[PDB]
Structures are given as C-alpha cells and as structure tokens.
Amino acid sequence: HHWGYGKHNGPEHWHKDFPIAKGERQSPVDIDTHTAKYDPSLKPLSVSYDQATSLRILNNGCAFNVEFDDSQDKAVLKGGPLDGTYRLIQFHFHWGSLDGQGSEHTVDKKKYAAELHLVHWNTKYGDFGKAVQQPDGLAVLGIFLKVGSAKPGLQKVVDVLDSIKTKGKSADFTNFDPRGLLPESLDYWTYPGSLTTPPLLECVTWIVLKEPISVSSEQVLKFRKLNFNGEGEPEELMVDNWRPAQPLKNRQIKASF
C-alpha cells in the first residue's frame, strides 16, 4: 500500500486517498480525564480469553499482528458499552522511537511509550469484512504501555520478533495466552471511533483501559529492531507507527469508574 508513517505518506497525507480521515468519528483522540464523565449505564466489562487460540504472528510492514482463530466464540469481549458478542481476531501494537511517544490515544495530552490494540468483531455480522462496514462492527480494547518492570506475558512475543524482522515474514505463534497482557484493573474510557490506519473506517467502539501495563526497556527496544521494509531492501526501522490524536468533534468520552 501507498500510505505509511513517513513525511511523504504519513497521517497528514492519508486524507487524499481516504477522505474519511477528516470525518466525524476518527481515532485516536486525546482523553481529557476532567471532562470524561462517569456513566452508570455501562454494564460490567467481560474479557473472556480462557479459550483463546493464537495461530501466527505477521510483520505486515507497519506493525506486527498476532492472529487468532475466530471461527468460533473462543476469545470474546462483551459487556461494558457493548451489546452482543465480539470475537478476538488479532492484536498489535503502536510504538515510538523514544519512550516519550508511541501511543495513539493520549491521556490529558500524555503520550505513552506504546499502545496495545486487541481487535474484536461483532458476531452479528458474520465475518470481519462485513463487520467493518457497520458503525458497531468492531470493539478495540486499547492498553497503554509504560517503561518500567518487564511484563512476563509479553516475553514470548518479544522473543519471536527475531524471526519476523521484515515485511511479509510470519511465524507460528500457537498457544499464546493474551490474558498475560492485561493490567489488574478493567477501569476504562469508551467512545465511538475508527480504525487508526487506512481505510480509517468509522466502525469501532473504543474501550481504553486506564491502567497501563509496564514493560521493560529491553522489551520495547526489541520492538524497535523490527523493519518496515522487506528483506533485501534498505533498512527502515519500524518505529513511530502511530497516528496522532484527531478532533473529538461531537463525541463524549464516558468513564466506567
């Protein structure tokens, strides 16, 4: 694809091919904690990952995706702002070149070192491709990463990155348990938004956890050793693959707490 994160094809250019980039419910956004309002209408959030079936990890040229078997209800998200059942299809991260940037969402303008997106689609629509054409087709659980102590449940991800250094490479990634990437608390913020890469479709219910997970410097350092380029091409480190905050427009961010 033509789009990327560089000066000539980055976020400020995406609107030429994807005019929805200037739409009414774009993501990410800044979460102003002083104007977000507690909502008693929100039901308990249910993250049910016990039967998750991971398959593969892929360097897609922009991030890496850990993919799941979504052919049945094995790992699902329900409750909170959501009606019905949303199946886990993949997760990926966004991160920076330096620890002071990398996240897509910000909190009172604070950028974290990275952001984890656990992507789920609404089973009422039958497949992911149909779900992304619907306003309520996806639910993305966003989790901030800060640099501190190592996250043990991340380490299996870090150690396979060696084998998917360049665009188009993949590796077997079975028997990975995404429960190991979650913080203690499920307190969250929620708002209606979009995919944060082209095609930027306005199909996502965002659920952003308040509590970040800690990862070590060595762990995030390994993320930054990945490449955007394919094998045998000049090296471009895979860093700063985040879209900045977009205008909130006519949206309210609701707090679960």
Ligand X SMILES: C#Cc1cccc(S(N)(=O)=O)c1
Task: Give the integer Cα–Cα distance in Å for 165 and 138.
Answer: 29
- Binding part of the chain for ligand X, among 43-51, 66-74, 192-200, 208-216 by CB under 6 A, reads 192-200
State which of residues 25, 105, 111, 117 lies at the interface with Zn ion (CB under 5 A). 117
Task: Give the integer Cα–Cα distance in Å for 132 and 242.
Answer: 20
> Shortest gap between Cβ of 169 and ligand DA9 (angstroms)?
8
Per rule CB under 6 A, is residue 62 in the interface with ligand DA9? yes
Quote the tokens at residue 19.
């005019």
Picked from ligand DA9, Zn ion, ligand X, none, the partner binding residue 39 (CB below 5 to 8 A depending on kind) is none
Per rule CB under 6 A, is residue 241 in the interface with ligand X? no
Question: What CA dihedral angle connects 140, 79, 82 and 40, to 10 degrees?
Answer: -110
Of residues 129 through 148, those in contact with ligand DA9 by CB under 6 A are none
Per rule CB under 6 A, is residue 26 in the interface with ligand X? no
Per rule CB under 5 A, is residue 120 in the interface with Zn ion? no
Per rule CB under 5 A, is residue 243 in the interface with Zn ion? no
Place of tokens 């639910």: 139
Residue 1 or 179 having the CB closest to ligand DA9: 1
Cα distances (Å, whole numbers) of residue 252 to 54, 71, 172, 195: 34, 34, 41, 18
Which residue, among 66, 71, 60, 93, has the nearest Cα to 174 in the 3D structure? 66
Binding site for ligand X (CB under 6 A): 90, 117, 119, 140, 195-197
Binding site for Zn ion (CB under 5 A): 117
